[PDB]
Amino acid sequence: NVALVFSGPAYAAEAARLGPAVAAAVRSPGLDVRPVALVLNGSDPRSLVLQLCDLLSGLRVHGVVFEDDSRAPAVAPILDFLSAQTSLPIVAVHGGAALVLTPKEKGSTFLQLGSSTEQQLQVIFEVLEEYDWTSFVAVTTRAPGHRAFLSYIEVLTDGSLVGWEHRGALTLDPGAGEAVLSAQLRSVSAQIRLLFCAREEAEPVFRAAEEAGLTGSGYVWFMVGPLPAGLFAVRSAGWRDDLARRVAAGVAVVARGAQALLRDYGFLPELGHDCRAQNRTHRGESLHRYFMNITWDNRDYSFNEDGFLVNPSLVVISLTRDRTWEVVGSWEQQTLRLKYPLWSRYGRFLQPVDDTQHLTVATLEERPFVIVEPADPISGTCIRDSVPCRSQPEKRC
Amino acid sequence: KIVNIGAVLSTRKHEQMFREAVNQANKRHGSWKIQLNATSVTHKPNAIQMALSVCEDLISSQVYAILVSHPPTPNDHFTPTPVSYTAGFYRIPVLGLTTRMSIYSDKSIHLSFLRTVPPYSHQSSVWFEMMRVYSWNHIILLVSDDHEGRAAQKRLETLLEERESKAEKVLQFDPGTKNVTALLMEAKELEARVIILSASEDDAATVYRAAAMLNMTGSGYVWLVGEREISGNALRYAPDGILGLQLINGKNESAHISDAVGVVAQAVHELLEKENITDPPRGCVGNTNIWKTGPLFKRVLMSSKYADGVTGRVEFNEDGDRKFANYSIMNLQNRKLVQVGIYNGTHVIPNDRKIIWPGGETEKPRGYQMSTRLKIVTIHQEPFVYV
Amino acid sequence: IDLLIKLARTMNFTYEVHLVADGKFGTQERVNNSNKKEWNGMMGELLSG
C-alpha cells in the first residue's frame, strides 16, 4: 500500500476526491494502489509522528507522498529522520519539503523533486549571455551555503571564448542600518546584481534597496534561493503541473521504484510496517541503490546518491507591471529555448539609465575597415574582440 | 516570574545534584525573581521515542534551553540528534555536553547547537605542535573515508601549508575494513615513518595487526594516534610506543553539569533589558509561529565570558566549542600509560619520567630514509633522446 | 642521457629510466567534473609519485 499524507487545511477539501482519481490513472502489473485522505493540520510534530506510525501499523503502507501549502521548510528534516529510521521511502512532490537539504543522514531514503543551487546557478549565466549581459555583480550575505556559492561562480567564466568580468561585495547586515547598507552598496562596477540570501532577510534588504535608489528600471536582479522592477527567479516548475499531475508523479516513482526489486524476485519488504514493536532495526540494505533509472511522461527522473533530483525541468520566471510571476522563457533538457524574440538591446526587459546617452549608429562593410562575420554557433554569442551588429534580423560580429 | 531551564540527563540519579546546582539561583546574578528549576527527566532508552518525550515534556514546561547528555550505553550520537531537531524546529537555542562528533559543527543540518566539549577534529591542532618541537617535517596519514575522518584531514592540510606545504601521502580506506594490507604495502615505500592514524576505535585494531606482520613496529617508526584508537580493544594488539592523546576534564559529567548551568544562569541575567523578552511558546498542542528574540538569545550564549569552572576558560567561537582544552599527552610504557606533557593551546612538556619509542629505543628516531634508487621520465626528441 | 650518466657518477645514485605514457610535455586542464584542474604528461607523473 502507498500512503498519501496531506498537510494543511487547504488540502483537506481536495484530499477525499484525489483517492480514486489516481487509482485508475496509472496502473502497474502485480500492484494495487489504495490512496487515503488525511486531514491532519497544525505545524506541531504531534500528528506527524503519532498518526503516521499508527498508519504504518494500521494499513501497512510503504511509500509516502507529501505536499504542503505554506513555504515553511522546517518540516522536511522531521520525515528525513523517519525515512532513515524505519527504512520508509518518503518522497515529497512540492511545498515546504521541496528545498534541497544536504548533508543527509546515512542509510536514508528521503527524496525531493527540486533543483540545487549549483544546478540553478548554471542556467542563470545562459540568460545573461543570451542578451549580452556580460556585466554582473555577485552580492550575498551570511548564508548556510555561501561557501560553494562563490566556488561555482569563478569556474563558469574561466573557460569559453567570451570575455567576462567579476565584481561583488562581501555581506549585508539587516541591523546595520539603512545608511550603512546604502554606503556599502556604492562599491559596484556593473549593472546586474545576483542575489542569494535568506527569505526573512530578503525583504529588509529590498526595503533598504530603495533607500539607496538602486531599484530603477535601469537595473535587474536575480534571486537564487518592496519588490524591485524586473525580478528573475527559477522555481523548477514550482507553479506548474497544478496538483493532479504532482500527486500522479509522486506515486509513479514509488510504483516503478518498488517494481525494481519485484522483477528480480517476489519479495514484500514490510520493514516500515512497524515503528516501536521491534527493538531492532539493523536490517537494511539497498535503500538507495534503486531510483536511478526513472523515466515517465517522456522525461528523465534520475536521482543521485545524496537523494535529490539531478535531471530537472527548470523554468525561468519574470515580473510584470501588475506584480505577477509569469514564465517568459523555457528549458527542455539543456536546450535554452527562450521565447519573446531577443532583438536589439536595452529595450527588452532592461532599459538604459540615461535615455539621452543611448544613441544608434550605422555602418557598412568594407574589408580593410569594417569586417562582418557570423556569430559563433558553439556558444550562440559573439566572439571576443568584437561587437554585435544586427543586420536590419540576425546577430553578427 | 520564574526562570526554568530544561535538561535531559543519563539517569535520574544524576538529577539529584542538578536540583542542587539550580536551587542556588538565589545567590546568583540578579536575585530579584529568578527561581531556577531543574525540570529534568531521564532520557528514553530508545532515541526514536525521544520525539514523543519532548513536546509533552520539555516545551510543555516553558523551557528556554535544553541539555542533552551521553547515555551510559556506547551509542553513536543517538541522544543529541532528536533534541537538536526538535529544538531547531522552534529555533530555541540548545546546548549539549559530551557530544564528541563533527556532524554538529555545520549549521546546514543543526542550526543551533553549542557544545562545551571540542570534537575529535581538534586533535589535529595538537598534532601540529606536538611534532614541531620534535623536528618532524612531513608525514603520511591513514584516514577513514567518512564524515569524521575527512574532518581531521581537511584541518591538518590547511594548517600544514604555512609550515611545510603539504604532507607526503594521504591514504584512505573504507570504514568497514577487514584484512586490507594493500594500502600498507606502499606505506613503507615513501621514507616517512611518521604514520598518523585516524581510524575508528575498532578499525584501528585491524591496522595494528596488519602492520605487525610487516615489522612496522620496530625501531625507526613513530605513531601519532588520536584518543579513539587507545581505549577498548585498541589497547590490546598495539605498538609498544604509541604517543596517543587524551582529555583531562573529559568524561567528567559532574563538573560539566555544574559548569553548564553557570553560563546559562548568567546569560539570563544579561538578557533582562527593555527590548523584546517574549517567552518561548508554551505547550505543543498548537504552536506554529516562532518567537523573534530566539536568535538573539543564542548569540548571547556564544559571547559569554565565564571565568570559572575549568580554569576559567569558558569561551566560544562562531560555533559551540571549547577553547584551550587540556589534553595531557600520554605515552605507553609497558602497559602503563604515563603522561609526558600537557597542552593548553601552546605545547608544554612536564616530561615526567622518560620516553620509550617502538623497538625499545631510547633516543627519538628521525623520520627520514635517503633513497639511492630513482625513477626518471624521458621523451622522444631526436637531438636529445633517441629511441 | 649522456648528461644523466655524469650526474649519477658524481652524486652516487642509481637510476631507472622509463618513457612517458601519454606522450605529451605538460599542461593544466579541467576534469569533466567541477573545475579541479590536473596536470598531464611529464608534469603529471612527477607530482603523482
Nearest to A191 by CA among A226, A157, A158, A165: A165
* A397 within 8 A of A386, measured Cβ to Cβ: yes
Cell of B174: 573504507
DSSP notation for B165-228:
SS-SEEEEE-TT--S--HHHHTGGGSS----EEE--TTHHHHHHHHHHTTT-SSTT--BEE-GG
Q: What CA–CA distance (Å, rounded) separates B260 from B310?
A: 11
Our measurement of the distance from residue B185's CA atom to the centroid of its chain's CA atoms, rounded to an integer in Å, reads 31
Cell of A377: 554557433
Q: Which of B48, B82, B284 sits opposite A46 (nearest CB)?
A: B284
Select from A315, A137, A323, A127 the least CA-distant residue to A230.
A323
DSSP string, A154-181: TTTSSSSSS-----------TTT-HHHH
Q: Is B82 on the interface with A (CB under 8 A)?
A: yes
R_g over Cα of chain B: 25
A158: contact with C, CB 8 A cutoff: yes
Q: Which amino acid is at B295?
A: P
B372 forms beta bridges with: none
CB B96 within 8 A of CB B80: yes
Residue at A374: amino acid letter = P
Q: Is A155 an interface residue toward C (CB < 8 Å)? A: yes
Q: Name which of C19, C46, C49 is nearest B378 (Cβ-Cβ).
A: C19
Q: Which residue, among B315, B338, B318, has the nearest Cα to B328 in the 3D structure?
A: B338
Nearest residue to B18 via CA among B125, B88, B97: B97
Exposure of A326 in the CB half-sphere (CA atoms within 13 A): 10
What is the C-alpha separation between B279 and B188, in angstroms, rounded? 62
> Is residue A175 within 8 angstroms of chain C, CB to CB?
no
Cα–Cα distances (Å) from A267 to A255, A270, C14, in that order, read 14, 9, 64
Question: CB–CB of A2/A19 below 8 Å?
Answer: no
Residues of C in contact with A158 (CB under 8 A): 30, 35
Whether the bond into B45 is cis, omega within 30 of 0: no
Distance CA(A317)–CA(A340), nearest Å, equals 13
User: Which three cell numbers, joined as nine digits, stand for A294?
Assistant: 526513472
**Touching B: A residues 74-93, CB under 8 Å:** 74, 77-78, 81, 85
Cell numbers linked to C3 = 648528461
The C-alpha cell of A327 is what?
514564465
- B-chain CB neighbours of A110 within 8 Å are none
Query: Smallest Cβ distance to C13: which of B372, B377, B378?
Result: B372
CA distance B337 to B325: 20
Q: CB–CB of B222/B193 below 8 Å?
A: yes
Nearest CA distance, B311 vs chain A (angstrom) = 34
Q: Alpha-carbon distance A276 to B304, whole Å? A: 41
Within its chain, how far is the Cα of A366 from the centroid?
A: 48
Resolution (A): 3.3
CA distance B338 to A179: 61
Q: Is C37 an 8 Å CB contact of chain A?
A: no
**C31/chain A closest Cα distance in angstroms:** 12
The Cα A8–Cα B89 span in angstroms is 17
Beta strands in C1-49 (DSSP E): 17-19, 29-30, 37-38
Distance CA(B207)–CA(B198), nearest Å, equals: 11
Query: Which residue, among A66, A54, A114, has the nearest Cα to A90 in the 3D structure?
Result: A66
Contact A159 C30 (CB under 8 A): yes
| Chain C contact present for B372, CB below 8 A | yes
Residue B151 has which C-alpha cell? 574532518
Cell 625507526 belongs to which residue? B220
In eight-state DSSP terms, residue A370 is: B
* Chain A residue at shortest CA distance from B45: A279
CA-based nearest residue in chain C for residue B383: C1
Q: DSSP secondary-structure letter at B63?
A: -
Cα A338 to Cα A328: distance, rounded to the nearest angstrom: 7
Residues 6+ apart with CB under 8 A from A6: A12, A15, A37, A38, A39, A40, A67
Coil, strand or helix at A112: strand
Of A295, A291, A313, the residue nearest A304 (C-alpha): A291
Between strands B337-339 and B330-332, the pairing is antiparallel
